[PDB]
Structure formats: C-alpha cells, structure tokens
Design a binder for this molecule. Structure first.
Ligand SMILES: NC(=O)c1ccc[n+]([C@@H]2O[C@H](COP(=O)([O-])OP(=O)(O)OC[C@H]3O[C@@H](n4cnc5c(N)ncnc54)[C@H](O)[C@@H]3O)[C@@H](O)[C@H]2O)c1
Ligand SMILES: NC(=O)c1ccc[n+]([C@@H]2O[C@H](COP(=O)([O-])OP(=O)(O)OC[C@H]3O[C@@H](n4cnc5c(N)ncnc54)[C@H](O)[C@@H]3O)[C@@H](O)[C@H]2O)c1
Ligand SMILES: NC(=O)c1ccc[n+]([C@@H]2O[C@H](COP(=O)([O-])OP(=O)(O)OC[C@H]3O[C@@H](n4cnc5c(N)ncnc54)[C@H](O)[C@@H]3O)[C@@H](O)[C@H]2O)c1
Ligand SMILES: NC(=O)c1ccc[n+]([C@@H]2O[C@H](COP(=O)([O-])OP(=O)(O)OC[C@H]3O[C@@H](n4cnc5c(N)ncnc54)[C@H](O)[C@@H]3O)[C@@H](O)[C@H]2O)c1
Ligand SMILES: O=C[C@H](O)COP(=O)(O)O
Ligand SMILES: O=C[C@H](O)COP(=O)(O)O
Ligand SMILES: O=C[C@H](O)COP(=O)(O)O
Ligand SMILES: O=C[C@H](O)COP(=O)(O)O
Lengths: 334, 335, 334, 334
C-alpha cells in the first residue's frame, strides 16, 4: 500500500479520491488539504453533481473525515509550507489546487515530507511531463520527483497524434477542443484576466486558450513546431471533444486513417485510447475512463488534409490517466 | 443634475449604470470603483451576456472609461476610504459590492465625502430600508443617510403583499421564490458557507435562503412575524417568480384576488407593480422595469388558502426600483 | 415469469425496461411498440443521456431487438387495435405513449390479448388509480383491469400528504411543483396546445397545469376538494420538487412536522417515502428509487400555515413506483 | 410594395417577419401557413424567448392575425398544393418549413399563385443558390424562380472563404461549426432520422452533418471539391461559430490573414462580413445582422495550415442575409 496526499480537494482532487477508492488495489488516500471546514469537504465528497452519491459512509469531525471506516486527515493550509505530509507517512502528493503548477512552489510538498509530487496540470520547472500510454516509459524514478500529468486535452490529443504521426506523418496540425466549462470560468459576467472566460459560462460559447497542442510536443518531441490550437468552452458540465485538422504527405482515406487508430487501440494502450463507431454524444462519454475516445464516424479527408475527432471526459478520463501515472510512480522506487 | 458614484461595478453596479443612462433625465454617474483594470471593466460594460451590447461607444485609459463621450473616473480601491467622492462632487453612492451591507462599514463612503449611501441589498445597522412604491413616503431626508433598497425578492413580494394584506388581511403566509442563479453560487461544486449554494448552479435546483422572508416586515411592519419562506435557485441566468401562499379570514375567489391587484396596479404605483393576463414564461419578463409582475393566470384559492405568483427580473427590475429610490433621494435635501 | 409489453418505448417506457432488468426477478419485457425502426429504437435503448450506457449487449433485426441474449419483438403501430399482444403471450401492458390515457382507448390492449393495462399517467374512465404505498391494498384483481399508476407528481405528493393528513389534518393545501422539463415541451418556441409549454424549455421557467393535486383525491378520497396547485417547469433534464403549503388546526412545529415523516418513513412504506436531513440539490435525487424524498431542512411553519418540500426523480422514482404496482398485479390472478 | 407569403412560420419564418418590419420599406408579409391555430401562432409571434416582446399590437381571429393594424391571413395546409397565394396577391414565398427543400415540391407555391420561391435552406433541383454578398450578382430574374438562400453556415463560411481564397488561395479545407441547437433536435432522447440529433439537445455536444462546406461550392464554384466538414450542436439557443482549417496556396501570417478580412469588410460587402478584434463570446453576436463576423483574435497559422473562425447568429444573421436576397428579387422583374 502506497500512501497518497491530495493538495486541492476540488473537481480533480475529488475525482482522484474516488478513482483511487474505486479502481486501485495498492494506493490509499490518507490526507487532504483545502481551504474549508470538514463539514463542507465531507459534503462535497459525499454528494457530486456529476458523479452522483459516493456509495460509502462518510462522517467527519473537527480533525478528519472518515470514509467507509477509514480515517483521512484534513488540513486547511493555503501555503503548503505549513503542511506535514510525513506525519501521515505519505509517499505521493497530487497537486490539484491549480495554484502550484510551478514546480518550484510544488516542491514545498517534498520539503514537507512527501517523496513525489504529481501536478494535475501543465507545469513550469517540472522534472518531467507525462501522458500515460504515450511517454510514461521515460519516467526516471531517481530523477523525476516533481512531475506533471499534463492537461485533459493533452491526454486526449497526444495518444491520437502519436498513432497518426507514426503511421502517416503529421506535417502541421491545428486543433480546436470543444470543451465543458470549468471552475476557472465565471458563472456571471465578472472580472477575469481572460476577457472571454470573464463571461457567463453556462450561456456562452467561450473561445479561449489551451496549451495542449504545444504541450503535446513535450510528450512527443517529434511534433515540436507542428501543432497549435485553442478551445471553445460550451455549456456542458463535463465531456469534451478534440478536433484536429492536419496535413500529411501520405496518401490517406477516411478508412485508412480510422484503421490506424483501430489497429493501435488494443492491449494496455487501449485503456488510454479507445476506438468507437458508435453514434456518440457527450453524455455517452461522461464517466469514461479513457484519455481519448476516437470517433471514427467524424473522420474527414480532403486531399492531404485530415480531420479527426476524439472525445474525453475532462474530469474522469483525465483523472484515470493521472491514476495510471500515479500507479507507475508507486510501482517503482520511492 | 445630481452626480452619482457606484461602488462595486458588478451585475447590479452595471445594471444601475445602464438604467441611469437609459432612464434618468437628472442623474449622471461620474465615478466608479471596482477591483480590476479599466480594460476589463470597460469590456464588461460594453458587452453583456444578458443585456446585450451597450449601444454607445466605450473607450478607456489609465484613469477613466468614456461612454458616449462622457468621461467616468474609475478606481480600484478595496478600501472605500481610499476614494474621494467629494472630489467629483458625488452626492449619492450606490453600494453594490456585496461586502459593505453593514451600514457602519458602508459609512466609509460618507467619510470619503459622499452625503448619501444606498446599499443594493438587505443591510444591517442601516438608517432605513425601502421598497419604492411601498414605503418610500417614509423617507426622511435629514435622518436617512445610509439606507437599503432591500432585495430583488423583497421588491417583488412587498408590493403584492401590501395590496392583498390591505384588502383582505394576511394572517400568515409562506413563500417560495423560484429564482435565477446569481454570482454568489458556484459554477462547479466547490466550498461555500451554504452547502447547497456550493453545488453547480446551472445543472441544479438549489434550495437556499431569501432576503424577502423577514425583510418585508421592515417595509410593512404590520406583517412582522406573519411571513417566511425560501428560494429554489434554478438554471436561468435572470428572471424569477415569487410564489406566496397565505391564509386570510376573508371570503375570496380567484377573481377577487386578481381584481385587487388590477385595481391597485395603476398610476405611479403601476410602475412598481404590474398586472398581467399574458401567458408569461421567464424570458418574457427579462428586462422588465417593474419590481413585481403579478401573473393573474396562476392565482389559486382553496377554502381560505390563497396562492399568488409574481414575476421579476431580479437584475433589471430590482435595478429600476433602486433607480426610483435614488431619484427620490436626489429630489430632496442633500446636506 | 409474468410477461410484459410496453406501448410507447419513450422516457418512461425505457426507464421501465431498465428498472425491470435491475429490480425484478419475476417480470420479463417481451414486446414493445413505438413509432420508429429497430436501429433507432435499439440505439435509444443502449445509449441514454440521463441513465448512461446499458450494460447489456444490444442487437436488432427487422422485427426485434435482442438485449443480453433475450429477443424482444418490436412493433410500430400507431393504432393499438393493430397490435397482437397474445402472439407473444403478454400478460401486462404498460401504456406509456401519452396518447391513450382514456381507458376506453387503452382497453384496445385487452382486446389485443393482454390481461391487464397499467397507464403510466392520470387516466380517464379507468377502473382504478393507485399510488403504491398509499392505496395499493385496494387493488381488486377481478375488477381492476385497466388501471392508472397516476403521475410522477402524484406519487411524490400523496405519500407525504397521507402521513401529514393522518397525523395533523390538512384543511386545504396548495402546491407548486418545480419540475424538470419533459418531452412534450418544446426545445425552441413552437406550437403546443399549452401556450407556455410552447416556449423553449431549456431557457425558461414555464408555468403549467398539473392535475396531481386533484388526482391525490383519487388515492386519498378524504382530500377531495382540499388540494390544488400547478407546476413550474425549469431547465433541468430530470429531478423535481413538490412544495406543498397547507393549513391545519393542529398545533405544530417544524420539529413535529419533520418527526411525523421520519416516523413513517420505515419498512415497506419507506421504499416509497424517504426522509432526509441532507443538503440536497436536484442532481442528488437523480436515479433515486423513492416516489417521495422529504426534505426536512425545507420545512417551515407560520402559525397554522405549514410548508413542506419533497423531491422526486420524475423519471426513475415514478418508474420504481410503477414497477412496485406492476409487481402487485403480477403477484395476483390475471 | 412587394407582397410576401411565408410557408412555415417557425424560428426562421418569424425572424423573417420581424426583419421585414425592422429593416424593409418595400416588402409586406400578407399571409403565412403553418400547422396550428391562430391563438397559438399569434402568441408565438408576440412573445419570443430569444427576440423578446414584439412592440406591435397583436390580435387574432379564426383566419388571420393582425399586427400593428395590418391583417395577415393564416393558413394551416400541410400540403402546399392546397394553398392559394393568389388570393392575397403574393409575389414572393419564403419556404421555411424544412419539408420542401426539393424545388420540385417547392414549385407547388408557383402553381398556387406565387411568382418566386425562396427556400430558406440548401435545396435540390433548384434554379440557383445564393449567398448574398458573394454571388447575388448572378441572379437571373427571368430564369431563377425557385431559388435557395443556402444555410446559416454557408452564409457564414462563404464570405470569409471568398476573401481568403481570393487573396491567399485555398488548396483544401475542413470546417467544424459549433452551432446552437435547432428545433429539429430532440429535447429528450427520442426517435430521429439522425441518431445523434435524437439525443437531448440541451445537455449534449451533438455531432451531425452539414452540407454547408460542399454548398459553398454552389456559390463559389472555384472551391468545388476543396471543402468538407461537420457540425457540433451545443447547448446555446442561438449563436454559432464556423471554424475553418485550410492549406494555403501561398505563405501567410496571422497578421496578413487578419488584414485581408479587415480590408474587405467595408461598404455593402461589409454588411455581410464584419471584422472584429473584440473579445467576443456567443451572446455578443446574438441579433447581429451580419452573415459572418470574423474573429481576428482566433486566427492561427502553422506552416501552410491556417485556422480561421467566424461568428454568426444562425437565426437573425442568416435571416438578414435572406432578406437582402429577398430585396434583390423584389427590386427586379416578377
Ligand atoms: N476538467 C478539469 O476540471 C481539469 C482537467 C484536467 C486538469 N485540471 C487541472 O487540475 C487543477 C484543479 O482544477 P479543478 O477543476 O479541480 O479546480 P477546482 O477549483 O475545482 O479545485 C481546486 C481546489 O483547490 C482548493 N484550493 C485553492 N487554493 C488552495 C490552496 N492554496 N491550498 C489548498 N487548496 C486550495 C479549492 O478550494 C478547490 O477545492 C488545475 O490545475 C486544472 O487546470 C482540471
Ligand atoms: N444579482 C442579483 O440578482 C441581485 C439582485 C438584487 C440585489 N443584489 C445585491 O447587490 C449586491 C451586488 O450583487 P451582484 O450580483 O452585482 O454581485 P457581483 O459579484 O456581480 O458584483 C460585485 C462587484 O463588486 C466588485 N467588488 C467586490 N469587492 C469590492 C471592493 N471591496 N471594492 C470594489 N469593488 C469590489 C467585484 O469585482 C464585482 O465587480 C449584493 O449585495 C447582492 O445581494 C443582487
Ligand atoms: N417525467 C416524465 O417523463 C413522466 C413521469 C410520469 C409519467 N409520465 C407520463 O408517461 C407518458 C409517457 O411520457 P414520456 O415522458 O415517456 O414521453 P416520451 O415522449 O418520452 O415517450 C412517448 C413514446 O411513445 C411513442 N409513441 C407516441 N405515440 C405512439 C403511438 N401511437 N403508438 C406507439 N408509440 C407511440 C413515442 O415515439 C415515444 O417513444 C405520458 O403519459 C406522461 O404524462 C411521464
Ligand atoms: N438556425 C436556424 O433555425 C436555421 C438557419 C438557417 C436555415 N434554417 C432552415 O429553415 C427551415 C426552417 O427551420 P426552423 O429553425 O425555422 O424550423 P422550425 O421548426 O422552427 O419551423 C418550421 C415551422 O414549419 C411548420 N411546419 C412544419 N411542417 C409544415 C407544413 N407541411 N406546412 C406548413 N408549415 C409546416 C412548423 O409548425 C413550424 O412552425 C429549415 O429548412 C432549416 O434548415 C434554419
Ligand atoms: O479541463 C481542464 C484542462 O486540463 C484545462 O483544459 P485544456 O487541457 O484545454 O487546457
Ligand atoms: O437575486 C438577488 C437578490 O437580491 C437576492 O435574492 P433574494 O432577494 O431572494 O435574497
Ligand atoms: O413528469 C411528467 C408528469 O407525469 C406530468 O406532470 P405532473 O405529474 O406534474 O402532472
Ligand atoms: O441552423 C440551421 C441550418 O440550416 C443548419 O445548420 P447548417 O447550416 O450547418 O446545416
């Protein structure tokens, strides 16, 4: 049993908590930190507008929350400097506040007693970035201590981009992700550093940035310089699609693009990348554990220009990818 | 011209700005304070997800925003004592941050040179509380300097309750407001002092508190102890309905209940309370200037139990009410 | 095994089918009728925007759908006169089209071979109307052959009203149900017999009629003349609340109102009526199997005036009530 | 005054009626046909969930609706051949039912007394297809009698594609439109010819086809064979964006792409195509009178791959395009 801490018990933090409880044979979460009281945090754990009710008993007191009879320590320290992970023999910390994506700030978890930190986001100054199934074999357990599990959109794009680039050669590609709103956006028009994410999220199509396409090149260096893109945030609470339009020198058809994905999406990698010929809408991919669900019915080809589309539950899909990365870390030294 | 300042250029602050510009012939907003830069503030002024584009040119610089050629000084002071309302000859400040609903915190504006503060919410320690059309004739220009315009829901409920209580006598009533989500609620499930307002606002029916419950007694003391209620926040961006179920000793019918409203909703008071027999849905009452839009189709009566329903645009409606109150304050002595 | 047919394989029809799979050991759905082809109907069975992916394997051909290896005959007959329920040895028909709530039309199912018809709505000219847990003991297997399971709202209100009426005496009450939109409302402003339900359902609070308050009298005749109310349809896809305000001569407090429900919400009746002190929102009661989930936190009292609020999943909760009624009819002579 | 009839008084029909009142001095709507009674149709005319209250007085009787004192005849004929447009001296019929896009069926309007039919959608067997501002100069008043004003998406894509093809050259391109839901989608999961459009529109991202990029080739024949694409329908009630990714014949920059649009978007053409550097979201382009609002901030370039995005109010903007086309027909023979 490896012991995990969660810093930032938010959408991703609580998705991760439930992913561990539900999916892992060898991890347990034993401490969490947020900015609220235990009555509030247990309530949010127990009841979820997306995931439904937790199917285990949840109690709390002024020190802790107890889930299915297992006591979890709870903190409310804004500054991780004030945490003590070692007091709970915690091995791995998930950094999911959204405020410590700089690895020089996140490393405070290691100063506070943990051996490893996994940032639930694109990072700065990290030791390494990983998309499980794409580049996790380059994980170095001696030297990779504060790592990123990249973004939701990256975990969707990279698996697809790898398969298609390996087979045919991507010359350049531009991406649009049509993406569930997230808590970074405002419910009502209000100040934001991004003037478009300032706008009422549940009644708007909101264009905004994604670092996903260039972040893809962090995990697939061969695609450096070859990808860029943006997001349209739209009114669904979770569930997203990545739409990539790329050129290739190869001779391709709808059928051979789709065959390349189907051929790859098997075995362990097929837990990351699924292939589908179903009449999917976003609600069909909510609570799907894949990082990427390729939608063969949406493939288009015009000359040497290809459009492909892959779905992802930006909460749960991404979380399951992060758990796969976490399991690997836990499988090796420290 | 009486000159007005706005503290907190949010939903209500910007609604208020547009209402003054669109509706008033004798007020001018000349200074605003918020917590952001002028690029951001002027974007949110020009573009609105509810009200649409402002039909006038909007420019900005390091110290101001200019609307239709009229320069508005802008500040970014978290503490209102770092403002100077007197420097721009501002007589009346709208307090619409949501953080200064305690009148003894809102009086920081007076310290900074204002003569009158109107809090855009239920207040504590306030000089007085008004729902325009209901009790504004009680306004005391000498003694009422930091005042409350009450809440959206109160401004909906009190007109209706007054007409009905006056005609038939309300023994007790209990209200449910089915209410648009507001910026106090969370887009995704996240911490909040209210465990239900914590929950994703646009996919949930969310039970919670309403101001109106007890606050009606501030403007209608004869109903102290006789009313209470709550809110169901639901997924519409604006537009709300107050549903009041009450007992009366009077013998009443749907018809006599409706006739009481229709006979009162006339003249000046008709600007606060309207009577409709239209097949209304919430989008029909968005951008309606009334505090309370009585829906005669929804009246029900069973023995001595009565149900009445009134609509309100909890943004614009309330805002037009606050503008009425501001106009009254501006029409009387400012010492 | 009692054999069931479903006329109208819509939201309620398909809920019902899933509920049978999940919750019954003696019923089997063997035939369904709708107005579409089997490719379309099987797709709607498999993929559901509310309930998610059906866990069984689904196939179809030109006259059936096969679910988990069990072949279900499919018809496409607008007029039930053209049905033959006897061909597949059907005992009970669920009438869930919306169009045959007059028992004089729904008895066509009997003439077509069925032994019992359960109308999934308030009916007219019916033999009996039941809310399970309220008046199901009055079911008469000889003489009750075309019956009504009432509405969703009636299954929410009646349990709560029975308990409060029995304990305190309801003089008169008026109800507002704040109700999810349903399929008979319009996505865009468009013709409807009801001028408000004509209006775009997902952007409006839409006032409309409900007979539930007068249908309660069919299952609790002691409340004849003493209840009325209406609905507000709001933009959630399922999940609803009944808000009842009533007068009583009893001396009552919030506490004693709440205690009355808690005391009753036990044993078998408790599978119909639940009692909750949780901080519930509508997503929390999606897929709850109760007809009625009383919210003790929302109880208010002013003198002799009382307001109570009970939740219901107008799809799943109602369906679980209809299945309980079906199970009773199935347990007796047919 | 040229007299207009509207067949199908739905979203587009009623937008058109309002556009005529607001924007025309030489057209008059004098009769309409739908499938409903006049109480219902007058209510829908008066109250609009998107456009708000009509500022004219509306009354009705059993064969008409009166607006601002002007009596409009109302028919309820499912079959166009049972209409008599000569009764009310109608010159031009807007065909906006969705059911008569085949010109061989739409021509029944001509037999019923009209001189010209404008189909508010891509057509089959038509005399000609027009995107105002792009190819309306090819209109032939002798020979073009049953015509199409194309789709919303075509009216958005074609102006932008004309300019970028003229200046830089499109080799091939693939489009995604992120599009408001429309009334042919289902509110609740229900039978539809399209198995995705079957799915609850207000909670899903719904992929579906669009002939729009291939219909561009009808108004810009130089682009025949060079465009394809699809739509994602998303939960906003109106307001859409067309995202085109194309390979350019010449090297370009973001700045030069943006400059080309700004340079062209002037004069009459600029009433069709606008240029924006504003931080736009969908609610900002609701009720905009342009067919295409080019968003300079979303232009991206990687090598010879280019992504451009243009907004459109798929109701009002398209309707303003349709009215421009109507004015042109009205200004000339018959
Ligand atoms: N779809 C998604 O939501 C998604 C997917 C992939 C990655 N991510 C990333 O994961 C991170 C978390 O996003 P989220 O959607 O869960 O955000 P969130 O707002 O839902 O959760 C953040 C949580 O951290 C808490 N918090 C904030 N500052 C804190 C501090 N200093 N100390 C402790 N707790 C603090 C908040 O109270 C909240 O509970 C971000 O970096 C985001 O980009 C999000
Ligand atoms: N929205 C409604 O329906 C509604 C209706 C009636 C009354 N009200 C009341 O009006 C008040 C404002 O509500 P809102 O909906 O406009 O909120 P909001 O969040 O939309 O706006 C608040 C604004 O104040 C600014 N702000 C916050 N703290 C500040 C400070 N210290 N100094 C300066 N600016 C500051 C914020 O940046 C924001 O722009 C609240 O008291 C609320 O109860 C709201
Ligand atoms: N919340 C709810 O959805 C709810 C709850 C309780 C009761 N009900 C009642 O259940 C009934 C069905 O409602 P619903 O929500 O499932 O509606 P729905 O529109 O989802 O389903 C009706 C189904 O019947 C089919 N159909 C229509 N006419 C037909 C005919 N002549 N023959 C065969 N099939 C036909 C349709 O194609 C559709 O699949 C109604 O009476 C409604 O009042 C609905
Ligand atoms: N965004 C848009 O809504 C949009 C944009 C561009 C083009 N269009 C096209 O315009 C047409 C109408 O689309 P809409 O969105 O207005 O649809 P709609 O569903 O809002 O309107 C169609 C109207 O036609 C009526 N109708 C149906 N069959 C009829 C018949 N046989 N005879 C007479 N009336 C009949 C309906 O009752 C309804 O009022 C379609 O061809 C559509 O593709 C729509
Ligand atoms: O949903 C949350 C993502 O991690 C942030 O989105 P993105 O991957 O498009 O940047
Ligand atoms: O909507 C904003 C109101 O002022 C807050 O609602 P309320 O009046 O029900 O408290
Ligand atoms: O959910 C659909 C209902 O059966 C019809 O509404 P109601 O129960 O409120 O009458
Ligand atoms: O909006 C209605 C259109 O006619 C349908 O969309 P489209 O132009 O992408 O086909």
């Amino acid at each position: 049993t490896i012991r995990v801490g969660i810093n930032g018990f938010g959408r991703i933090g609580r998705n991760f908590f439930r992913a561990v409880l539900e999916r892992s044979d060898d991890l347990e979460v034993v401490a969490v930190n947020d900015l609220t009281d235990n009555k509030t945090l247990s309530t949010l754990l127990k009841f979820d507008s997306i995931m439904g009710r937790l199917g285990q008993e949840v109690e709390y007191d002024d020190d802790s929350i107890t889930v299915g009879g297992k006591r979890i320590a709870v903190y409310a320290e804004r500054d991780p400097k004030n945490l003590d992970w070692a007091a709970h023999n915690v091995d791995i910390v998930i950094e999911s506040t959204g405020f410590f994506t700089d690895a020089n700030a996140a490393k405070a978890h290691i100063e506070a007693g943990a051996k490893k930190v996994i940032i639930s986001a694109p990072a700065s100054n990290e030791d390494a970035t990983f998309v499980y199934g794409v580049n996790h074999e380059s994980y170095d357990p001696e030297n990779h201590n504060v790592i990123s599990g990249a973004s939701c959109t990256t975990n969707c794009l990279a698996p697809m981009a790898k398969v298609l680039n390996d087979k045919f050669g991507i010359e350049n590609g531009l991406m649009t992700t049509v993406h569930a709103y997230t808590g970074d956006q405002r419910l009502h028009d209000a100040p934001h550093r991004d003037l478009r994410r300032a706008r009422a999220a549940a009644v708007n199509i909101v264009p905004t940035s994604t670092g996903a396409a260039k972040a893809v090149a962090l995990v697939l260096p061969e695609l450096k310089g070859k990808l860029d893109g943006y997001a349209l945030r739209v009114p669904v609470i979770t569930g997203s699609a990545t739409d990539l339009t790329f050129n290739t020198k190869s001779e391709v058809t709808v059928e051979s693009i789709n065959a390349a994905i189907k051929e790859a999406a098997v075995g362990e990698f097929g837990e990351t990348l699924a292939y589908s010929e179903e009449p999917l809408v976003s609600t069909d991919i909510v609570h799907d554990s894949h990082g990427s669900i390729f939608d063969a019915g949406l493939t288009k080809v015009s000359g040497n220009t290809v459009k492909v589309v892959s779905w992802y539950d930006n909460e749960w899909g991404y979380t399951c990818q992060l758990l796969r990365l976490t399991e690997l870390v836990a499988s090796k030294l420290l």
